Design a protein around this motif. Structure first.
Motif, PDB file in Angstrom:
ATOM      1  N   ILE A  53      58.004  -3.096  42.994  1.00 29.22           N
ATOM      2  CA  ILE A  53      59.182  -2.251  42.842  1.00 29.22           C
ATOM      3  C   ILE A  53      58.767  -0.967  42.140  1.00 29.22           C
ATOM      4  O   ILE A  53      58.083  -1.006  41.109  1.00 29.22           O
ATOM      5  CB  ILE A  53      60.295  -2.978  42.069  1.00 29.22           C
ATOM      6  CG1 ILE A  53      60.865  -4.118  42.914  1.00 29.22           C
ATOM      7  CG2 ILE A  53      61.403  -2.014  41.692  1.00 29.22           C
ATOM      8  CD1 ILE A  53      60.272  -5.464  42.606  1.00 29.22           C
ATOM      9  N   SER A  54      59.174   0.169  42.700  1.00 30.23           N
ATOM     10  CA  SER A  54      58.782   1.462  42.161  1.00 30.23           C
ATOM     11  C   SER A  54      59.396   1.687  40.785  1.00 30.23           C
ATOM     12  O   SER A  54      60.502   1.229  40.489  1.00 30.23           O
ATOM     13  CB  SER A  54      59.206   2.582  43.110  1.00 30.23           C
ATOM     14  OG  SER A  54      58.307   2.695  44.198  1.00 30.23           O
ATOM     15  N   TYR A  61      66.358   6.133  41.697  1.00 28.33           N
ATOM     16  CA  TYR A  61      66.439   5.001  42.610  1.00 28.33           C
ATOM     17  C   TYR A  61      67.463   5.223  43.715  1.00 28.33           C
ATOM     18  O   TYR A  61      67.399   4.553  44.750  1.00 28.33           O
ATOM     19  CB  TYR A  61      66.767   3.728  41.832  1.00 28.33           C
ATOM     20  CG  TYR A  61      65.604   3.204  41.029  1.00 28.33           C
ATOM     21  CD1 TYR A  61      64.477   2.697  41.658  1.00 28.33           C
ATOM     22  CD2 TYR A  61      65.625   3.228  39.642  1.00 28.33           C
ATOM     23  CE1 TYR A  61      63.409   2.222  40.931  1.00 28.33           C
ATOM     24  CE2 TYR A  61      64.560   2.756  38.905  1.00 28.33           C
ATOM     25  CZ  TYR A  61      63.454   2.255  39.555  1.00 28.33           C
ATOM     26  OH  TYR A  61      62.389   1.783  38.827  1.00 28.33           O
ATOM     27  N   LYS A  66      65.371   1.495  50.554  1.00 27.72           N
ATOM     28  CA  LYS A  66      65.479   0.135  50.035  1.00 27.72           C
ATOM     29  C   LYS A  66      64.113  -0.513  49.851  1.00 27.72           C
ATOM     30  O   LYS A  66      63.948  -1.365  48.971  1.00 27.72           O
ATOM     31  CB  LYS A  66      66.347  -0.711  50.966  1.00 27.72           C
ATOM     32  CG  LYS A  66      66.781  -2.040  50.375  1.00 27.72           C
ATOM     33  CD  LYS A  66      68.288  -2.208  50.447  1.00 27.72           C
ATOM     34  CE  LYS A  66      68.706  -3.603  50.018  1.00 27.72           C
ATOM     35  NZ  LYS A  66      68.551  -4.591  51.120  1.00 27.72           N
ATOM     36  N   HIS A  68      61.432   0.600  48.580  1.00 25.39           N
ATOM     37  CA  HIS A  68      60.833   0.876  47.281  1.00 25.39           C
ATOM     38  C   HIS A  68      61.465   0.069  46.156  1.00 25.39           C
ATOM     39  O   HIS A  68      60.835  -0.102  45.107  1.00 25.39           O
ATOM     40  CB  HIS A  68      60.939   2.368  46.962  1.00 25.39           C
ATOM     41  CG  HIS A  68      60.186   3.244  47.911  1.00 25.39           C
ATOM     42  ND1 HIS A  68      60.683   3.607  49.144  1.00 25.39           N
ATOM     43  CD2 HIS A  68      58.972   3.834  47.808  1.00 25.39           C
ATOM     44  CE1 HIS A  68      59.808   4.381  49.760  1.00 25.39           C
ATOM     45  NE2 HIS A  68      58.760   4.533  48.971  1.00 25.39           N
ATOM     46  N   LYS A  69      62.685  -0.429  46.343  1.00 24.88           N
ATOM     47  CA  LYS A  69      63.442  -1.049  45.265  1.00 24.88           C
ATOM     48  C   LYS A  69      63.590  -2.558  45.399  1.00 24.88           C
ATOM     49  O   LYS A  69      64.292  -3.167  44.585  1.00 24.88           O
ATOM     50  CB  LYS A  69      64.835  -0.416  45.177  1.00 24.88           C
ATOM     51  CG  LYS A  69      64.831   1.095  45.210  1.00 24.88           C
ATOM     52  CD  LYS A  69      66.244   1.636  45.246  1.00 24.88           C
ATOM     53  CE  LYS A  69      66.734   1.797  46.673  1.00 24.88           C
ATOM     54  NZ  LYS A  69      68.100   2.386  46.727  1.00 24.88           N
ATOM     55  N   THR A  70      62.960  -3.182  46.390  1.00 29.59           N
ATOM     56  CA  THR A  70      63.131  -4.613  46.587  1.00 29.59           C
ATOM     57  C   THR A  70      61.832  -5.219  47.093  1.00 29.59           C
ATOM     58  O   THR A  70      60.877  -4.517  47.431  1.00 29.59           O
ATOM     59  CB  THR A  70      64.274  -4.917  47.562  1.00 29.59           C
ATOM     60  OG1 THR A  70      64.548  -6.323  47.551  1.00 29.59           O
ATOM     61  CG2 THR A  70      63.891  -4.508  48.971  1.00 29.59           C
ATOM     62  N   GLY A  77      64.077  -7.360  44.118  1.00 35.65           N
ATOM     63  CA  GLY A  77      63.725  -6.619  42.924  1.00 35.65           C
ATOM     64  C   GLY A  77      64.559  -7.002  41.722  1.00 35.65           C
ATOM     65  O   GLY A  77      64.910  -6.146  40.905  1.00 35.65           O
TER      66      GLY A  77
END
Ligand SMILES: [K+]
Ligand SMILES: [Mg+2]
Ligand SMILES: [Mg+2]
Ligand SMILES: [Mg+2]
Ligand SMILES: [Mg+2]
Ligand SMILES: [Mg+2]
Ligand SMILES: [Mg+2]
Ligand SMILES: [Mg+2]
Ligand SMILES: [Mg+2]
Ligand SMILES: [Mg+2]
Ligand SMILES: [Mg+2]
Ligand SMILES: [Mg+2]
Ligand SMILES: [Mg+2]
Ligand SMILES: [Mg+2]
Ligand SMILES: [Mg+2]
Ligand SMILES: [Mg+2]
Ligand SMILES: [Mg+2]
Ligand SMILES: [Mg+2]
Ligand SMILES: [Mg+2]
Ligand SMILES: [Mg+2]
Ligand SMILES: [Mg+2]
Ligand SMILES: [Mg+2]
Ligand SMILES: [Mg+2]
Ligand SMILES: [Mg+2]
Ligand SMILES: [Mg+2]
Ligand SMILES: [Mg+2]
Ligand SMILES: [Mg+2]
Ligand SMILES: [Mg+2]
Ligand SMILES: [Mg+2]
Ligand SMILES: [Mg+2]
Ligand SMILES: [Mg+2]
Ligand SMILES: [Mg+2]
Ligand SMILES: [Mg+2]
Ligand SMILES: [Mg+2]
Ligand SMILES: [Mg+2]
Ligand SMILES: [Zn+2]
Ligand SMILES: [Zn+2]
Lengths: 109, 77, 91, 114, 97
Positions: A53-54, A61, A66, A68-70, A77
């Motif tokens: 996760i970034s 965010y 999506k 990048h966040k999960t 995430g």
RNA sequence: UUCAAAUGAGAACUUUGAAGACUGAAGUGGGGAAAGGUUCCACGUCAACAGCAGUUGGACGUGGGUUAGUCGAUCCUAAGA
RNA sequence: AUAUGGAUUCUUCACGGUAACGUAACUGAAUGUGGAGACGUCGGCGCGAGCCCUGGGAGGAGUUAUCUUUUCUUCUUAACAGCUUAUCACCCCGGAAUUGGUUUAUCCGGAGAUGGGGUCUUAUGGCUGGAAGAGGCCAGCACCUUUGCUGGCUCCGGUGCGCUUGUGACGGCCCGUGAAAAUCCACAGGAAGGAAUAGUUUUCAUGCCAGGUCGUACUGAUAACCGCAGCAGGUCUCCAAGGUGAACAGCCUCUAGUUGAUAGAAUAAUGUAGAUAAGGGAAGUCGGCAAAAUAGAUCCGUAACUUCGGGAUAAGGAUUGGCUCUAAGGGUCGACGAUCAACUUAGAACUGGUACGGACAAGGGGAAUCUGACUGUCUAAUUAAAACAUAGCAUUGCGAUGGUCAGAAAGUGAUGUUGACGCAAU
């Protein structure tokens, strides 16, 4: 050596007023104000940094896809892989134990 | 500013109906051996991004200049 | 080598505060900075956070304890008394 | 630049030119960190190259954490001596087992002919 | 091997200059490995009457060439009339004013 | 602090050039917060002020100047009101 | 606001990897959950940036009686974007004592180490685009103006207990454990809406429009603020070159800035500030007030007493320059060889008007008595102390329908987001 000045009207070395000294294409030294560093999102079960996760500032965010966040798993995430696996094992074993407890109660009467 | 590497993608970009201006820049770099070669950069001004295609072959560069649309404002130099 | 004969950890206080007070402080600082056995994972990895909080660096389990020791003798006695009373209540 | 060159050749460094303590001029912690890092990287290099085994490596690592070693030359000479002693012991044990095997063979043939 | 050329044609045709003396100064004063006069098969200084040519395999540079030329001009009081000026890379000339 | 030139009725104090010095980067440097409010800049100009002087000025007179989606306020809550 | 492309769907709401997880996408209401926002201080270590130092080379400038391949100076690369790049962490194989790995700092491993192979965060660095067309340094021309141009080079390294700063993994400390909220995202869930002469998808790409209001000058102080003033006072903060030197000390210098304090002529007394002084050495004086003496660093040596921690730099001694050498302490690559690199320590010889922490900088010491334990605090503007505080000790009240204390009163309040290891009063 060339000396630099703040670019904003804040003259104080606060957390939101951090600067870096960079050399410009004009060949001179200039302060560049740097945003506060991001914190890695953390597992809601164990608190470790979530893999894959970034790490961005909270509103950044909203500007990333999506992916990048999960993470492609049952809790993405939010929870780490080990905590998700522990949740799976606990859920399965406790439901099995609930079944055996129910049958034990039925066969003790 | 983005760099592209596909000639077909660059030709598609040159016709994107929002690209109205391009520039052709000539550099005089050296090919890691001291030989002065001609590098051609094709820069197409998109609405949001400037797309740059770098060609180290002068012949392919001339071919691309010939293949550029005639309503592009090519802006040599 | 043995750097101090008797002051131990209280050598940081120098000659101040009195020898009796330094000794009393030394005993409880040794207790509070000691490493204790984790009752959950069996490792000697339990250390004090703030007073009354003892956390295992392995398995990340924290237990409420005494201000300077993991388990006070009063708390051990209370645990035994509660176990005995629970056993009497159940039977 | 001329003064720096003179200092590099070692001039202007006597007791009359020093105003800070030896620790202030160069920390003993810095010196020890340099020494221990060269000792540990030499030990790791020897272990990776097979010049020493992991058990001798562990013993020498603990010894280098202890003072026990003035420098890289001292560690190398100690490794040489330790390996020589190990070879001596191994040769002694090999000769002892060879003599035992010889005696056992002689006993066997004696019993088979008697 | 690196080549450095000096165009002395302007001050040699304007009278106050001696290309032969400038070249002789170059052999006598060019240093190799700290030693002067030891230009053994490493630094060559040739002449054409208008262009002094230096071919060097040892450590040599246009900065050193300019330093030696300025020293020669100062020795012959030729400064404030002659400038050692670089036109192209490793191609210099004595501008006369 | 000194020399010369320019300006000027008038020059120790203005300007320029030359020289000698200092602050010596925790500055006599370059920016800001509070505060001030035009002191910023240009032109003209010296009755008063600059505890000498003045052709100079933070002075006098007349004008010009402060350009933001991205820097701040604005929004949030803190002790508190 | 949006139309395409892309993606998805005949197994409707994707595939791949054992896995950590990857991606250009890859439906997701209520409700709930989680994360970020969001956090102390110090210490050492690692890394990054900028600066510093330095080599080669391409230019310009300075010195050149003599010497100096020499002294100074330019050689730069933003936000943003793509690829790539970490410590830490995690995953797969495997089962380890002859315990191994490992940090400067001793932690980790059958709750699975070492090892082999992978995954991830992108601080940060590298290449590329931005971008050489910019900026910088030069050269050659022309110039009634606007000055106009025309060319060239703007490259390649090295070094580190260096300085500033950012950051990472750690460690020390607490009866101190060192904000909140706005906001953003994610997850659980499956409400609902979805395909086949066709549906879905503005967390993928591109494309269109708009982003208001107020502030923005300048000083920020030995002249722009306050002190009646153009007042030696006071007033918060950022950046920070070289040398000497431990050093942001003192002294000199570079960039930048200033050269502003009413001046001229003399050199009486008495002054203010700075100093020296034969012999004596506190005989002065209430009193060594003032001044002097000591001072850095290295080595030697260090008493009474003590709460064993100190006293202690006790006391008391020796040395220190310059120069030429010697020795020891390392990295990388393949017992050694090659190569590269920086200082710290020790020793020797020589040398001089025996000088040498040569300016600067910089403890006087000892034997005791009274007193307060100590660090700390106060009479701003005559008292800094033995006074106050302090930790320690002791006493007192109080179990909430309470103790102590507020309020004119209240359906009021502080302790109290508290509960006798507490609060309150001494
Ligand atoms: K991901
Ligand atoms: Mg030091
Ligand atoms: Mg130490
Ligand atoms: Mg004057
Ligand atoms: Mg002047
Ligand atoms: Mg001074
Ligand atoms: Mg000075
Ligand atoms: Mg003005
Ligand atoms: Mg006056
Ligand atoms: Mg007047
Ligand atoms: Mg005015
Ligand atoms: Mg903003
Ligand atoms: Mg796909
Ligand atoms: Mg492992
Ligand atoms: Mg970055
Ligand atoms: Mg700081
Ligand atoms: Mg401004
Ligand atoms: Mg300003
Ligand atoms: Mg200022
Ligand atoms: Mg005022
Ligand atoms: Mg030094
Ligand atoms: Mg006397
Ligand atoms: Mg005398
Ligand atoms: Mg005497
Ligand atoms: Mg007397
Ligand atoms: Mg008397
Ligand atoms: Mg008396
Ligand atoms: Mg005195
Ligand atoms: Mg002493
Ligand atoms: Mg004493
Ligand atoms: Mg006291
Ligand atoms: Mg103190
Ligand atoms: Mg007073
Ligand atoms: Mg007083
Ligand atoms: Mg008292
Ligand atoms: Zn977790
Ligand atoms: Zn545990």
């Amino acid at each position: 050596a060339q000396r630099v000045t703040f670019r904003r009207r804040n003259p104080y070395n606060t957390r939101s007023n951090k600067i870096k000294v960079v050399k410009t294409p004009g060949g001179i030294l200039r302060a560049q104000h740097v945003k506060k560093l991001a914190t890695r999102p953390k597992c809601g079960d164990c608190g470790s940094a979530l893999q894959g996760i970034s790490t961005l500032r909270p509103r950044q965010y909203a500007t990333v896809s999506k992916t990048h966040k999960t993470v492609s798993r049952a809790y993405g995430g939010s929870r780490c892989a080990n905590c998700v696996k522990e949740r799976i094992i606990r859920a399965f074993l406790i439901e099995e134990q609930k079944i055996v407890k129910k049958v034990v109660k039925e066969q003790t009467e | 500013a983005r760099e592209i590497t596909d000639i077909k993608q660059f030709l598609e970009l040159t016709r994107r109906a929002d690209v109205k201006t391009a520039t052709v820049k000539i550099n005089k770099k050296l090919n890691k051996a001291g030989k002065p070669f001609r590098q051609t950069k094709f820069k197409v001004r998109g609405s949001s991004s400037l797309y740059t295609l770098v060609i180290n072959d002068a012949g392919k560069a001339k071919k691309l200049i010939q293949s550029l649309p005639p309503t592009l404002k090519v802006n040599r130099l | 080598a043995k750097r101090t004969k008797k002051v131990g950890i209280t050598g940081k206080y120098g000659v101040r505060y009195g020898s009796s007070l330094r000794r009393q402080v030394k005993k409880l600082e040794i207790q509070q900075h000691a490493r204790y056995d984790c009752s959950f994972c069996g490792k000697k990895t339990v250390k004090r956070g703030a007073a009354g909080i003892w956390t295992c660096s392995c398995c990340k389990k924290t237990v409420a304890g005494g201000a300077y020791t993991v388990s006070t003798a009063a708390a051990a006695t209370v645990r035994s008394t509660i176990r005995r009373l629970r056993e009497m209540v159940e039977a | 630049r001329a003064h720096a060159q003179s200092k590099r050749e070692g001039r202007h460094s006597g007791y009359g030119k020093r105003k800070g303590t030896r620790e202030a001029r160069l920390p003993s912690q810095v010196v020890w960190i340099r020494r221990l890092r060269v000792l540990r990287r030499l030990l790791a290099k020897y272990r990776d190259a097979g010049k020493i085994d992991k058990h001798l490596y562990h013993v020498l690592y603990k010894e280098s954490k202890g003072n026990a070693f003035k420098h890289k030359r001292a560690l190398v000479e100690h490794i040489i001596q330790a390996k020589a002693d190990a070879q001596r012991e191994k040769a002694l044990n090999e000769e002892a087992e060879a003599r035992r095997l010889k005696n056992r063979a002689a006993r066997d043939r004696r019993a088979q002919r008697v | 091997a690196k080549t450095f050329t000096v165009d002395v044609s302007s001050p040699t045709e304007n009278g106050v200059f001696d290309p032969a003396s400038y070249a002789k100064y170059l052999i006598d004063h060019i240093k190799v490995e700290g030693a002067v006069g030891n230009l053994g098969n490493a630094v060559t200084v040739t002449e054409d009457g208008t262009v002094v040519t230096v071919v060097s395999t040892a450590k040599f540079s246009g900065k050193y060439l300019k330093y030696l030329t300025k020293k020669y001009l100062k020795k012959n009081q030729l400064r404030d009339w002659i400038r050692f000026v670089s036109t192209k890379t490793n191609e210099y000339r004595l501008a006369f004013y």
